[PDB]
Amino acid sequence: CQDVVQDVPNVDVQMLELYDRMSFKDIDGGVWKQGWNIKYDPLKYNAHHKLKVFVVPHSHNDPGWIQTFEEYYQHDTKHILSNALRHLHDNPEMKFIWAEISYFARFYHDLGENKKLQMKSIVKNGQLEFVTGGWVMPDEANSHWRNVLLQLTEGQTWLKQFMNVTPTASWAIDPFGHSPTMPYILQKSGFKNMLIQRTHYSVKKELAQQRQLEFLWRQIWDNKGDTALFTHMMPFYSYDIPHTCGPDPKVCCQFDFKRMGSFGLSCPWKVPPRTISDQNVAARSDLLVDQWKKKAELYRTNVLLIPLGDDFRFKQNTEWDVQRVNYERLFEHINSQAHFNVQAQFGTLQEYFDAVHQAERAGQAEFPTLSGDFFTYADRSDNYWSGYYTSRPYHKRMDRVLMHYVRAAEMLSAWHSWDGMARIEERLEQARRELSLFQHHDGITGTAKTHVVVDYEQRMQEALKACQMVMQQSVYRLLTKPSIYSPDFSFSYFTLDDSRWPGSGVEDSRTTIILGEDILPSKHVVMHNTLPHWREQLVDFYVSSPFVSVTDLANNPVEAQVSPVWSWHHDTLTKTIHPQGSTTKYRIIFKARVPPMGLATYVLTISDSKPEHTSYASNLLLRKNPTSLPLGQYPEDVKFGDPREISLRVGNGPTLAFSEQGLLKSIQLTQDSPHVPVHFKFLKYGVRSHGDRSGAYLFLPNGPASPVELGQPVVLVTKGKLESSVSVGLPSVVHQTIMRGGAPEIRNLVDIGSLDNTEIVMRLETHIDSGDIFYTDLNGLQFIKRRRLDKLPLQANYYPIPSGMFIEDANTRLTLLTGQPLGGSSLASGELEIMQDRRLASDDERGLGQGVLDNKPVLHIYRLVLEKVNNCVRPSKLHPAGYLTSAAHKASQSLLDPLDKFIFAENEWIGAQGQFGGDHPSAREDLDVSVMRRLTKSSAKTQRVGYVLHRTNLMQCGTPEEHTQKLDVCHLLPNVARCERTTLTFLQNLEHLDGMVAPEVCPMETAAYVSSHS
Ligand SMILES: *[C@@H]1O[C@H](CO)[C@@H](O)[C@H](O)[C@H]1NC(C)=O
Ligand SMILES: [Zn+2]
Secondary structure, three states: OOOOOOOOOOOOEEHHHHHHHOOOOOOOOOOOOOOOOOOOOHHHOEOOEOEEEEEEEEEEOOOOOOOOHHHHHHHHHHHHHHHHHHHHHHOOOOOEEEOOHHHHHHHHHHOOHHHHHHHHHHHHOOOEEEOOOOOOOEOOOOOOHHHHHHHHHHHHHHHHHHHOOOOOEEEEOOOOOEOOHHHHHHHOOOOOEEEEOOOOHHHHHHHHHOOOOEEEEOOOOOOOOOOOEEEEEOOOOOOOHHHOOOOOHHHHHHHOHHHOOOOOOOOOOOOOOOOOOOOOHHHHHHHHHHHHHHHHOOOOOOEEEEEEEEEOOOOOHHHHHHHHHHHHHHHHHHHHOHHHOEEEEEOOHHHHHHHHHHHHHOOOOOOOEEEOOEOOOEOOOOOEOOHHHOOOHHHHHHHHHHHHHHHHHHHHHHOOOOOHHHOHHHHHHHHHHHHHHHOEOOOOOOOOOHHHHHHHHHHHHHHHHHHHHHHHHHHHHHOEOOOOOOOOOOOOOEEEOOOOOOOOOOOOOOOOEOOEOOOEOEEEEEEEEOOOOOEEEEEEEEEOOOOEEEEEOOOOEEOEEEEEEEEEEEEOOOOEEEEEEEEEEEEEEEEEEEOOOEEEEEEEEEOOOOOOOEEEOEEEEEOOOOOOOOOOOOOOOOEEEOOOOEEEEOOOOOEEEEOOOOOEEEEEOOOOOOOEEEEEEEEEEOOOOOOOOOOOOOOOOOOOOEEOOOOOOOEEEEEOOOOEEEEEEEOOEEEEEEEOOOOOEEEEEEOOOOOOOEEEEEEEEEOOOOOOEEEEEEOOOEEEEEEOOOOOOHHHHOEEEOOEEEEEOOOEEEEEEEOOOEEEEOOOOOEEEEEEEEEEOOOOOOOOOOOEOOOOOEEEEEEEEEEEOOOOEOOOOOOOEEOOOHHHHHHHHHHHOOOEEEEEOOOOOOOEOOEEOOOOOOOOOOEEEEEEEEOOOOOOOOEEEEEEEEEOOOOEOOOOOOOOOOOOHHHOOOOEEEEEEEOOOOOOEEEEOHHHOOOOOOOOOEEEEEEEEO
16 A cells, blocks of 8 residues: 555645745736737648647536526526437537536436437437536535545446446536545546646646646645546636637637627627638638637647537527537638648547547657645636635535435445335435535535525435435334334334434424323334444433433443433523523433444333433523523523633543633643643624625635624533533524533534624634644545645635644644534634635625525534644655544544434334344444445346445554454355445446455545445
C-alpha cells in the first residue's frame, strides 16, 4: 500500500501552492474580459499539420431548478429528446451528447417500441452519446461521496440495461466549483476522461497562460499517480455559445443561430447572427476560424473542442435546422479552403478525447500533473459562490439522514432474497432515485425556487418512508424463528424511532412507548448497526412512565437513565424562550451493544416504583424570575437558580465549563490537565446596502460578523449518570451541549424566523496557534489543507464543510464534525466557524429570480473533539492533506451512521430472537462497508451481492489499538461460488478472486466486490 502521509507528491500544479503565489487581480483583459488578447502564428497550421475541430452539440437540462423535474420534462425535455431522436435519425452526420439519465429514463420508458429501437440505433451508431451517465450532474461541494457514487450507479446501471453502453468520459459544465472526489470515483468506475467548467476566473487565466487547462488530475496524497484521470478545463466564463467558440463573445454570439429574433433571443453585444449564404460564408468563416485558432492557443494538441449548446437547447425542430444547416455551410467552406488548414465537423465528447490521446501518443504533446480542488469559485469580481454551502440547510441535513436510511435499507434487506410481492426492489429503487435526484446541482445546493425545493422535500419524504418499510420488514424476518415467520408485506411490524430527524422542536413525530398495568407491561425494541464492527451507543426512547427498566433478551438488566422530555417555547407573552417539561412522557436512555452489520433486541418493562437499574437525572433551570416546572411522576423535583457558570463531567470523560449564558468556555481532558479555552459564540453577517447583494448562491457580507445580542437567556442543566446536557434558548437558536462520556455532541435548533438579510454563524474561539491554516473535508472522503488568504475577501475564505473541519498547532487540535453540509472557515488563528442558516431578501443575478425566504426550523448536529496531537505522526508541512484521529473519525460515524432504532408495533412478538450478526467479523476501525446491495431478484439461479469497501486513513498517535478480524465480504453470505472485484458501479468485472476471498483495501482506497451464490 502507498503511504498517504509521509510522501509529498511531486506534481506540476498543486492548487494550494498555486493559490499562495497567484495575485488574483481582476483586470480588464479586453474582449476576453478575464484573460488577454490572444495572438497566434498563422503559420502554425499547414497542410501537414491541420487544426481538427469538433463541434459538440449539447443541451443542459436541469432536473429541477426554476421548474420542477416534471414541469421541465413536460414543457421542455420531452420535446428536446423527441426532436433529437427525429433529427439525428434523419441527419446521419449530426451528433448530440446527453448527461442527465433521470430525464432520459423518464423519456425512454414512455416511448413506443418502434421509437425505442430507433433510439438504440442512434446510440449504437455513435450519433447520440451519453456523457458521465449519472442520474444527475451532481453538486460537488455539499454532496457526500457515497451519494455521488449512488447517483452515478443509478444512471449507469439503467444505461447498461437499456442502451448497452457505459460512458468513460464525464461532462460537468455547471456545478459551482469542482472536487477531486469526482476523478477519484470516476477513475474507479472505468472512466478515462473528464471535463469541468466552473473554476475561478483567475485560475482559468493562470492555467491558460501555461497551457495547463488539460491535466492528469490525481488525489492530493497520491505519490505514484495511480488515481490520475485526464481532465479538460474549459477556458471561458460560460458554457453558452458566446463563450465557447473563442475569446470574443461579441463574435461567438453571431454563431448561435437561435438568436436571430423569432425565438425571442438576441445577442447582448449587439451584433446578431446572420444566416450563412454563399455571399457571406467566406467573411463569416474568416471570423469563426480566427476565434477557433485563438482558443487553440490555450491548449497543447491540434484537436480543438467547441461545445455548441446552452440551457434546454435543441427543443424546436426549427432550432435543430437553423443550427445544423448554418454550421454545415461553414464546414463545407472551411474544409475546402486549404489556406485555413482546418478540418471541422460535428462530434461527440469521446471523439474529442480519443483524438487528443492519439495526438499525445504520436508525441505531439505531454500533459502536466495536478492535485487539489477548485473551491471557492468566483465567476466575476468578488462574487464568490460560498452562499450555497449553507442555503436551505433543512434539506442539506435531510440529505444526510436519507443517505443513511438508503444504506441501512439496502443492507438489512440484502441478507435475504425476497418474493416480488414484498415490493422490496420497488421501494429501494424509489428511495435510491429520489436521493440521487437531490444530488443535482440545484437540489442539495439550495439554489432552486421555493416550489421546487418543496418537490425535492416531498420526494425525499416518500424515500424515507420507503426505507422504513424495507428496514422494518427486514428486521422482522431476521429476528423471528423461521417456522413462525408469517409476513404481511403491507404491515408495520416496527416503527423507526429517530431522535435527531426531524428533531425535537422541528416535528413531534416520535411515538411514545405506552406501558401500563392495565394495558401493556413491556415492549421489545431492536437496534441495527450498519458499521462492520461491534458498536456501543446510547439510545433513547420516549415512554409513558418514568418507572421503566431495561433488559437484554437473556433477561440481563441493563443500566438506564430517565430524563424529562423538554420542549422549548418562544413565549410571545413573556417575551422569553424557555423550556416546558412533559408530565406524561419521559425519555429512557441506555447503552445498546450491537454486532457488526447486525441487530440487538432489548425489552422495556414498567414497574410501579423506581427500578433497581434505572437512575433519574437532576434538572436545574437557571434564570431570574422562575416559575414552577412540575414533571408528573418524575421522581426528582426541578431546581432553580440565578444564571451562573457551571461545570459538568460524565463518566471519566472530559470536564466542560460553561458561561452563565450556557455556552462552552473550556474543556479539561483529564483530572490533571488544564482547562483549555474553547468558547462557543453566535454572530451575524448582514448584506451590503450598496453594490451586489447576497442570495442563494453568493455570500457578500457587509464586513466581519457582529455578535448576536443574547440578553439574559434561560439555561437548562440536566445531570445524569449516563448523559448530561446544558441547553440555552438564544435568539434564533436553542443551543445544546450533550455529554455522554467522550467528546460532546452539539445540537442547534435553528429558527431564523423573520430576520431578513441575516446569516447566523456559530464560531469557536480558542488560543490554538493555527495561524492561517485550517482543514476541511471534501465530500466526506478526505481532508484538504486550507490557507486563509487576506489578499482575498472574507467570502473567498469560506469553504464547504460537508462533514468536518479542524485547526491545530504542534500540540493541540480542535475538530468539529457535522451531520450536515454547511459553509465555514477559520478567519483568524485559533478560530473555526460554520454557518447555520441564511435568510436573504434579494436575488443574486444568477437566474434563480428570488431570494431565500423559505427558512424553516432545522436541528443541526455536531461532535466537538479537542485532542492532544503532539505524539501523532502527521504529514510534513508541505503535504496538502490532513487526516483524522480515531476519536474524530468515530465521532463523524456517530453523526452520519448512528444505530437505527425499531419499536415493535404489536403487543406480542411471537418467535422473537435476541440478536443477528454475532458471528459477523468485527473489522479494523478504519474500514467500512459503505454499500451492501443484493444485485439480483429472486428468480435468478445465481444470486449476486455487491459490496463497496472503503478504508480511510487515521493518524498513528501511540495507541496500541489491536485485535480485529479480517473482513472478507465475499463470505458474509453462505454458499459462495465466485468472488469478483468490479468497478464501483458493479458494472464491469475486473478480477476473478482466488479462493473466493475479497481482500481488504489500502488506506484511502475504495474497492467493490460482488459475491455469487449458488
Ligand atoms: C452490446 O454491445 C456489445 C459491444 O458492441 C455487442 O457485442 C453486444 O451484442 C451488444 N448487446 C446487445 C444489445 O445485443
Ligand atoms: Zn444546471
